[PDB]
Structure 1
Amino acid sequence: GSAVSKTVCKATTHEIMGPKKKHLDYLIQCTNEMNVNIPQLADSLFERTTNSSWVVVFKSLITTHHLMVYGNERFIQYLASRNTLFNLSNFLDKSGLQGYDMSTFIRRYSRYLNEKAVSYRQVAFDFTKVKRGADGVMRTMNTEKLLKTVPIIQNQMDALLDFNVNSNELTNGVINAAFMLLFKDAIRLFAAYNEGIINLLEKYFDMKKNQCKEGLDIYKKFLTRMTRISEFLKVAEQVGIDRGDIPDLSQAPSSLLDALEQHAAALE
């Protein structure tokens, strides 16, 4: 309890480095123990986003992101239930040149964690942690849920690509640590997105005339997002990331629009 709040502060010192593994692994340990005051923990991290240093604020967001990905699901569930999550729409650290540069990136990253939280609330599971493959969640979803679900994947994606950082702006250990977590979410979210699309394209040719309209707009959007995902993956390539970890987007079903349009034409 007193130890939690103190490890939160250790994760979020003014040291210009990402949160330390020892403090992040302890916090993960916390979330999983039986009598955790999850609200109190979350509360301590929000409190550190009220701070005026960009270093503190951005490391508190990174820790929260880290804990949504690796912490007990109970942590992401609480964040998604809250009324207000991160209120950093006006954040600005005028202290120096780094503060000025890193304040736009704090505003964007805070927006992305809020969307991640809303995404979880709207479908009640984490797109980046559900069973993959031909019997996974997104491949086997039934038609109604699929059509309501794939748009929520797309809105999370869009908020991730809005961080919109160039490789030559990843100039300190804080923003890089955020970047690497954004990268991890992106490839897992794209995997969930490509899988929903596969399913959609399979079902499309037995769908009703007005489900093909919903599905056709989902797909058109999938194609525009893929051009922007490839730009983000080029930043990843530039920074030096293992190229076997970058998805090959040429494998996505990206050339079927014509088939989907002629088939909607025939349905009229």
Structure 2
Amino acid sequence: GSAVSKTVCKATTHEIMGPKKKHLDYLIQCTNEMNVNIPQLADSLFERTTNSSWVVVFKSLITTHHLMVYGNERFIQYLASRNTLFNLSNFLDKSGLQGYDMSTFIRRYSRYLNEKAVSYRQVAFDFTKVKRGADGVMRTMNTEKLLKTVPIIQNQMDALLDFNVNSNELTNGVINAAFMLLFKDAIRLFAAYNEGIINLLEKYFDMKKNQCKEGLDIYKKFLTRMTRISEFLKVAEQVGIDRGDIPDLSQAPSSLLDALEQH
């Protein structure tokens, strides 16, 4: 409460760096205790995003992201259960040039975090954390659910990609911390999108006519998102990310000629 509320403030000071690890680890522990009240924790983070300063606001967003990623699942479950989330579509800190320039990234990042909660609300699991491989959800899921799901991933991906940053704009510790978390989500989200497309192809020839028509549209939009993701990973390469952490995109786009299996 007070100890939680104080940690929230310390994670979101005016200092120009991302939230400190020591504050973030204490918050993560908070989400794992059955006696902590999650809504009060969340409320304190939403209140910090009514501040007028870009630094405070951007740090409150990054804290929320890190908790969705490393915190107990009850945190994102609460965020998904609310009706309204971040309303920063018109944010503008005009106090200095860094302010103006960062305001745009705040808008875009907050939209991605909203879309991340909405996706959890719709399918009741986190695309970034579920079992991959061949024994996983995205690999072993029925054809009806599949057709319903893949388009939700696509949507979460588009909001992520709209962050639209260039290497020459990653110039301070705050936006750099945001980018590192976005990178982590992008690679896990791609893995899951890819798995769904693999299942699709597996089942495509064996399926109803109008189904086939829906699948065709999904494979279609996947190929177009494949090139956007390439551009995103190139910004990561330019910035200096370890090349061992960057996934190899040499997987699944040869086959567009089932655009005729609808004879």
Q: Please report the TM-score for the alignment, with normalisation by the length of structure 1.
A: 0.96
More deviation, 252-261/98-107:
252-261
Q: Deviations over 1:125-162 (max 9, x none)?
A: 00000010001010001000000000000000000000
- Give 3-state SS (helix, strand or coil) of 2:206's partner: coil
1:258 is displaced (CA, Å) by 4.5
- The 2-side partners of 1:120 and 1:89 are apart by 21
Q: CA deviation at 1:261?
A: 4.5
How many Å apart are 1:56 and its aligned residue?
0.3
Distance 2:57 2:103 in 1: 9
Q: 1:252 to 1:108 in 2, by over 3 A?
A: same
The 3 A distance-change label for structure 1 pair 260 and 192 is: farther
Q: Is the 8 A contact 1:216 1:260 kept in 2?
A: no
- In structure 2, how many angstroms separate the alpha carbons of the residues matched to 1:251 and 1:260? 22
Distance 1:194 1:159, change over 3 A: same
Identity %: 100
Q: Give 5+ residue unaligned stretches, structure 2.
A: none
CA separation of 1:260 and 1:152: change in aligned 2, threshold 3 A? farther
Shift of 1:36: 1.1
Q: What's the secondary structure of 1:177's corresponding residue?
A: helix
CA distance in 1, matches of 2:90, 2:256: 43
Cα distance, 1:250 vs structure 2: 1.5
**Following TM superposition, by how much is the alpha carbon of 1:75 offset from its aligned partner in structure 2, in angstroms?**
0.4
- Contact 2:205 2:261 (8 Å CA) reproduced: no
Query: 1:255, CA displacement in angstroms?
Result: 3.5
Whether contact under 8 Å (2:61, 2:110) holds in the other structure is yes
Whole-angstrom distance in 2 between the partners of 1:127 and 1:225: 17
Q: Which stretches in structure 1 are left out of the alignment for 5+ residues?
A: 264-268
Match of residue 125 from structure 2: 125
> Given that residues 18 and 59 in structure 1 are in contact (C-alpha distance below 8 angstroms), is that contact kept between their aligned partners in structure 2?
yes
- 8 Å contact 2:54–2:103 — kept in the other structure? yes
SS at match of 2:85: coil
Cα distance change of structure 1 residues 254 and 177 upon mapping to structure 2, 3 Å threshold: farther
Give the CA deviation at 1:260.
5.8
Task: Count residues in correspondence.
Answer: 263
**Residues of 2 paired with 1:257 and 1:61: CA distance?**
43
Flag the structure with higher helix content: 1
Note the C-alpha offset of 1:46: 0.2
CA RMSD of aligned residues (A): 1.1
Deviation at 1:254, TM superposition (A): 4.4
Look up the SS of the partner of 2:128 in the other structure. helix
Tell me, in whole angstroms, the C-alpha distance in 2 between the residues paired with 1:19 and 1:124. Answer: 29
Runs of 4+ displaced beyond 6 Å = none
How far is 1:90 from its partner? Answer: 0.7
Deviation at 1:256, TM superposition (A): 3.6
Instruction: Answer yes or no: is the 8 Å Cα contact 1:51–1:57 preserved in 2.
Output: yes
**In structure 2, do the counterparts of structure 1 residues 258 and 49 end up closer, same or farther at CA, with 3 Å as the change threshold?**
same
Q: In the alignment, is the contact (CA less than 8 A) between 1:88 and 1:110 conserved in 2?
A: yes
Describe the shift of the 1:254–1:189 C-alpha distance in structure 2 as closer, same or farther (beyond 3 A): farther
Aligned mates of 1:171, 1:254 — CA distance in 2: 38
CA–CA distance in structure 2, aligned partners of residues 254 and 86 of structure 1: 40
Q: Distance in 2 between matches of 1:229 and 1:30?
A: 34
